[PDB]
Amino acid sequence: SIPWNLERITPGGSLVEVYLLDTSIQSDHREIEGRVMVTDFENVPEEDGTRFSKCDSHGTHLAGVVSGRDAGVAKGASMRSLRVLNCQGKGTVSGTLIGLEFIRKSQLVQPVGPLVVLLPLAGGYSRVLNAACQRLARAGVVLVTAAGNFRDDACLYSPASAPEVITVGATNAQDQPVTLGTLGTNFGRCVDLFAPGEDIIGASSDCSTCFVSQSGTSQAAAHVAGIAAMMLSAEPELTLAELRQRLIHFSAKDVINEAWFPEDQRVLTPNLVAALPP
């Protein structure tokens, strides 16, 4: 039938543009061709050592998760990509800030409809990054971010900890928090909800028709970005608060076993798994 994750969120998005701040992307992958516009934007740090497994692996997969023809959430959504992560998946706070500013400048020059900005990345708590996100949010833009993959309190990371952003943790096919190596999804009061983030099939930049399964809070956040795009296309006048309320209203309630989280984080971590409205 359909991928487990696409079933999990289903008990499209054409009015909305989704900005992706990530690695490079293979914009002619069949899954996203003609749905994604690669902006001239690039701001990345030099690679350290000689590592990566393609330069565009991460972003291509997430673009597919959001808008992909066969495996996407919001199949009518258009996307715009900015490169703020290098070949090893590493960026800078200052590069991210310049990207967020680019988005606002782009909107002012040529306004369209509702904008969703997907930030599938995390660093340490950052006053300036949090402030920039808050600012962009107040300007009328919806920001969705990854909770982080450090099995830690999301409040210690940015943009996860930012006010006015939608922060997304990862759950697996059994609605349980995702383990990633020795770590896993972040948790805590700064996380808004969870979404499918394990074993998620999506566009592989290895070839124009290739697919690969990936895991992470990036993939989880990509789901919510897709869901947000669908909800905003149906109800374009929603304020951020109303959108947040709709995301909570249509979430699966109390399906996560909270024993996975540290004792004190259980009450603080919302037991919600995102889903589309009926």
Binding site: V93, E101, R104, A132, G216, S218
Partner: protein, 92 residues
């Protein structure tokens, strides 16, 4: 008074590059002037600086490559709210 911040996760810090954030109402022209003043004051003390970017649209300020030695000086500049050392973010 303006405050200085750097990433709590040591390995993720990027010393030598700083985000100078100015007060909310600061205009682009003021930000630009403040950047050039920093370069002037730093130059008189024998320090090189590079203004990598001037921010406006969300936050006013600029991105400067410079020695951390200059932080006490930079914090005294007009319009400065705070200054943050650049740091890394990672694909999740």
């Amino acid at each position: 008074t303006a405050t200085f911040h750097r990433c709590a996760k040591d390995p993720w810090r990027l010393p030598g590059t700083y985000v100078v954030v100015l007060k909310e109402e600061t205009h682009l022209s003021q930000s630009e002037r403040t950047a050039r003043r920093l370069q002037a004051q730093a130059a008189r003390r024998g320090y090189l600086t590079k203004i990598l970017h001037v921010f406006h649209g969300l936050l006013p300020g600029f991105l400067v490559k410079m020695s951390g030695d200059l932080l006490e000086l930079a914090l005294k500049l007009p319009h400065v709210d705070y200054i943050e050392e650049d740091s890394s973010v990672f694909a999740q």
